[PDB]
Design a protein around this ligand. Structure first.
Ligand SMILES: Nc1ncnc2c1ncn2[C@@H]1O[C@H](COP(=O)(O)OP(=O)(O)OP(=O)(O)O)[C@@H](O)[C@H]1O
Ligand SMILES: [Mg+2]
Ligand SMILES: [Mg+2]
Lengths: 50, 385, 380, 124
């Protein structure tokens, strides 16, 4: 309902009706896309250490 | 300190009280559904099948038909049926049309775009007035243009002079220019619009000029207002080059804003805060006084100014009362207020390496060496010959 | 110390919950415009909604072949016919038509084009300014009277001399010269209509959409009698070419071109004056500047000392001033500059007096305002 | 398609352009436009005639010396020249005389010039 909804929240819709399905937190952003290429940053301090 | 505590006690009994009141008050049982409401309701569901595909009302012809463009390339010669008055509708209004057959079922839009919401940033200024350690003299030039007609219209009216249009803030970063901007904003409690000028630099066709028009509309609607065109020079004198598709856009955006800043006449009820680093060595694009009036150059902090800023910071520190405050500020040449801010932050960081929770008497005399040396390197002044 | 830390922690939670509770307040109550007696309208409206005659899909005749060949806006062509009875003589190339969703027949011819309506919003009628309170005694003020008023008031003299009636004036001057101010004053006095066009606003482009608007607006003018068409800021878009660039652009050459050809060669006019506002003639394409487009050019000349005392006096009247104040002395100290610079000096003199806590501005105030503005301009 | 000897004679083509250096390169290949005509600067003779065309419209004033006007002007094309003509008559409209004088005209050149008319000078 209108209560739950928040401004600027991305939403799913069913068919050509456009009834609300689910809210999507889900957002396409370039920073997120850059992280996926990047993955979990490796590695221990000591190796760098000198 | 204490002054702040006194306020907490009141704020926490206001919220509580309100929240409880609210249940009843909103309704929860009140449930207006008497004849006036019921009418509206019944009708609205019947007429409106949904979804409803919005239009823009291009013209009226008096015979309760209108010509609208829908989002579809075919436009549609529509009936006006039901709800919204014919008079109330003036051309250029955005309108709700019914999906089965396109008919004017009302308006609730008023050319609502997401762009206006984004810009709209009245939200809690982080600054109150004179939390800042800045000097009375600099702020009481901005205040004179912006505050003084709203608080005392008597003097301006009596003189007969027009209220000023705009100021330009330029310094010198680390004079707390944007701090100054949100000090002013708090006092006026005006609708405080903000837009950054780089959002008006795009390869996209003609979008810059469209955005420029929006800004004047927004301010007027939500008047009295302050419009912060922050980095005005992004559009203007500052560059994004023209061997990048910029031989189209940048020209059109610069001209467009320029043309609306003069207008058919100065509005004289929309205040502007124009930010730019300085337009001394840059080209000027802020087109003469009377549309920007008083222009404000913030001094580079002198010895007495930084005393006041310094006093804020020393309060939290313990063992800086034995340290003589006066001698730290003097010994350093006259430099940014940012550099005293930098020093306080470094000072604490440095105490921790010595292993003392808050600064030692020694730590403060030491702090000055690291910050002065770093900053003088960063920014080198002409050497006397 | 510590028991008063936890007073801050509590405070914060509360303030946040109150803000969300606003949504709950607004409630679910729905009500729409149409008060007093326009909800009783809605009862009629219901049966006609179910009724069918609305919408009509809108298309445009592109050729009449004695049925008609219509072209829709989605771009798709049909041969159609008359509906109830639609006279042949009503449907013309460019004329819009109302046709049914899917039975595809003309009901009503509709007036040609939807594009005038869009651009008629920009258009402003005969602005009014009083020529007497027009600052300066400028030479420029006088040559405007020759161009605009004299052919409208007395076309006889022009015929007799066997000169062409002047119709074109090009206004250019530094900003604050008063280009907009003087054009509004002569619009009023001559009692001729006015058409506001702003060329900076043109952005609707599909390779030559900007050219459609410009032809229609200029044509609107011809239809009108005793009128002014004032194209504002044609420094860019219908001003400078952007061909010069590496990748370059020519949507601006379309708009520019169209205007040149309407001006150049035979083409009727209904006493159309052409006013052009460029900040600098330099930016203006040379094609336009050189003659056979706009007849006259005047370089604005910054107001004389007599004209600068004159603007100051206009301001000083609005002000509360000292008796025996030397307007002329203030003016002489001041640079030879626009009416603008002079407007600003009176603005700051007012304010320093207010600060100093005076209601009547002294001579001395305007000595201060002057010192302020000189320095500003210089430093840049 | 005009090439041949039958197609050239019926269908004829004129074309107008200002800058000639911005064209398509396949146009400078072959004889796409079979004749290229550069306009020369106007001469004295050319100026003196164009003035006459404009002046006929106006009242004939034999005080006009077409020769004197033409000698001081250098490189005024047809449109430029008509600007001069209209100006001499505009002074005379203010004056009230239907007559235009040769004097009005010599002054009237210098508004069409870059310079404003009779610019102030220290000696005279
Ligand atoms: N003749 C004058 N008398 C008094 N003030 C003047 C005069 N002319 C112009 N000004 C002042 O200059 C400012 C702008 O005038 P106006 O809007 O006509 O400018 P413009 O030269 O057309 O500029 P733009 O380049 O912005 O299109 C105003 O503050 C106005 O009061
Ligand atoms: Mg800042
Ligand atoms: Mg203007």
């Amino acid at each position: 309902n209108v209560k739950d909804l928040k401004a600027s929240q991305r939403v799913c819709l069913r068919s050509d009706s456009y009834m609300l399905h689910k809210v999507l937190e889900n957002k396409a952003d370039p920073l997120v896309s850059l992280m996926m290429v990047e993955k979990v940053p490796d590695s221990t301090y000591d190796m760098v250490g000198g | 300190t204490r002054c702040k505590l006194k306020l907490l006690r009141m704020e926490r009994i206001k919220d509580h009280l309100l929240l409880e009141e609210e249940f009843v008050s909103n309704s929860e049982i009140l449930k207006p559904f008497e004849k006036k409401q019921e009418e509206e309701k019944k009708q609205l569901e019947e007429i409106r099948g949904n979804p409803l595909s919005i239009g823009t009302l291009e013209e009226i012809i008096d015979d309760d038909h209108a010509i609208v463009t829908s989002p579809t390339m075919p436009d549609y010669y529509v009936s006006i049926l039901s709800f919204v008055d014919k008079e109330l509708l003036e051309p250029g209004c955005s309108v709700l049309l019914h999906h089965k057959t396109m008919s004017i079922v009302g308006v609730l839009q008023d050319d609502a775009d997401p762009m206006v919401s984004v810009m709209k940033m009245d939200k809690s200024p982080t600054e109150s007035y004179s939390d800042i350690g800045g000097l009375e003299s600099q702020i009481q030039e901005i205040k004179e243009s912006v505050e003084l007609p709203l608080t005392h219209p008597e003097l301006y009216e009596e003189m007969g002079i027009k209220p000023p249009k705009g100021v330009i803030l330029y310094g010198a970063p680390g004079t707390g220019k944007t701090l100054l901007a949100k000090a002013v904003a708090n006092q006026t409690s005006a609708t405080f619009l903000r837009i950054v000028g780089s959002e008006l630099i795009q390869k996209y066709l003609g979008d810059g000029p469209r955005l420029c028009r929006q800004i004047f509309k927004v301010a007027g609607e939500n008047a009295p207002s302050i419009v912060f065109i922050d980095e005005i020079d992004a559009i203007g004198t500052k560059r994004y080059d023209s061997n990048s598709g910029g031989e189209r856009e940048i020209q059109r955006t610069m001209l467009e804003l320029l043309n609306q800043l003069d207008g058919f006449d100065d509005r004289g009820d929309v205040k502007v805060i124009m930010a730019t680093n300085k337009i001394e060595t840059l080209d000027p694009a802020l087109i003469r006084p009377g549309r920007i009036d008083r222009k404000i150059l913030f001094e580079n902090p002198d010895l007495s100014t930084k005393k006041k800023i310094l006093g804020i910071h020393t309060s939290k520190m313990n063992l800086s009362e034995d340290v003589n405050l006066e001698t730290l500020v003097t010994t350093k040449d006259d430099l940014s207020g940012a550099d005293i801010q930098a020093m306080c932050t470094e000072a604490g960081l440095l105490a921790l390496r010595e292993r003392r929770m808050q600064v030692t008497a020694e730590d403060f005399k030491q702090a000055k060496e690291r910050v002065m040396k770093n900053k003088v390197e960063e920014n080198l002044e002409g050497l006397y010959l | 110390a510590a028991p008063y830390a936890a007073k801050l922690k509590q405070t914060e939670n509360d303030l946040k919950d109150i803000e969300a509770r606003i949504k709950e307040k607004a409630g679910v109550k729905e009500s729409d415009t149409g008060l007093a007696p326009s909800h009783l309208w809605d009862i009629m409206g219901d049966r006609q909604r179910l009724g069918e005659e609305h919408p009509l899909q809108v298309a445009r005749c592109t050729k009449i072949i004695k049925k008609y060949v219509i072209n829709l806006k989605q771009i798709a062509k049909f041969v159609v016919g008359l509906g109830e009875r639609v006279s042949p003589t009503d449907i013309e190339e460019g004329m819009r038509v109302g046709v049914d969703r899917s039975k595809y027949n003309i009901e009503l011819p509709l007036p040609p084009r939807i594009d005038p309506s869009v651009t008629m919003m920009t258009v402003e009628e005969k602005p009014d300014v009083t020529y007497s309170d027009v600052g300066g005694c400028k030479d420029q003020i006088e040559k405007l009277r020759e161009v605009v008023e004299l052919p409208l008031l007395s076309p006889e003299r022009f015929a007799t001399l066997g000169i062409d009636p002047p119709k074109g004036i090009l206004l250019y001057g530094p900003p604050g010269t008063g280009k907009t101010l003087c054009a509004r004053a002569v619009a009023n006095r001559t009692d001729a209509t006015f058409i506001r066009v702003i060329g900076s606003e043109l952005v609707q482009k599909y390779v030559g959409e900007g050219a459609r608007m410009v032809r229609e607006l200029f044509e609107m003018a011809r239809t009108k009698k005793a009128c002014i068409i004032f194209f504002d800021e044609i420094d860019a878009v219908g001003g400078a070419r952007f061909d010069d660039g590496a990748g370059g652009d020519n949507e601006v050459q379309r708009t520019m071109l169209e205007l040149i050809t309407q001006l150049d060669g035979f083409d009727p006019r209904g006493n159309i004056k052409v006013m052009f506002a460029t900040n600098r003639p330099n930016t203006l394409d040379p094609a336009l500047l050189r003659p056979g487009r706009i007849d006259r050019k005047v370089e604005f000349s910054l107001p004389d000392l007599e004209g600068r005392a004159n603007i100051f006096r206009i301001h000083s009247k609005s002000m509360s001033v000292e008796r025996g104040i030397r307007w002329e002395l203030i003016s002489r100290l001041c640079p030879n500059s626009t009416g603008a610079e002079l407007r600003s000096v009176c603005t700051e003199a007012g304010m320093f007096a207010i600060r100093a806590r005076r209601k009547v501005a002294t001579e001395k105030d305007f000595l201060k305002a002057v010192d302020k503005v000189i320095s500003g301009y210089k430093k840049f | 398609q005009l090439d041949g000897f039958s197609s050239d004679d019926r269908v004829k083509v004129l074309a107008a352009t200002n800058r000639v250096d911005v064209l398509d390169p396949a146009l400078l290949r072959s004889g796409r436009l079979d004749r290229k005509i550069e306009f020369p600067l106007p001469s004295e003779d050319s100026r003196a005639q164009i003035l006459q065309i404009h002046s006929r419209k106006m009242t004939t004033d034999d005080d006009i010396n077409w020769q004197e006007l033409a000698r001081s002007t250098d490189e005024f094309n047809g449109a430029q020249l008509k600007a001069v003509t209209v100006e001499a008559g505009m002074i005379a409209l203010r004056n009230g005389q239907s007559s235009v004088k040769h004097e009005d005209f010599v002054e009237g050149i210098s508004e069409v010039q870059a310079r404003k008319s009779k610019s102030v000078s220290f000696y005279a």
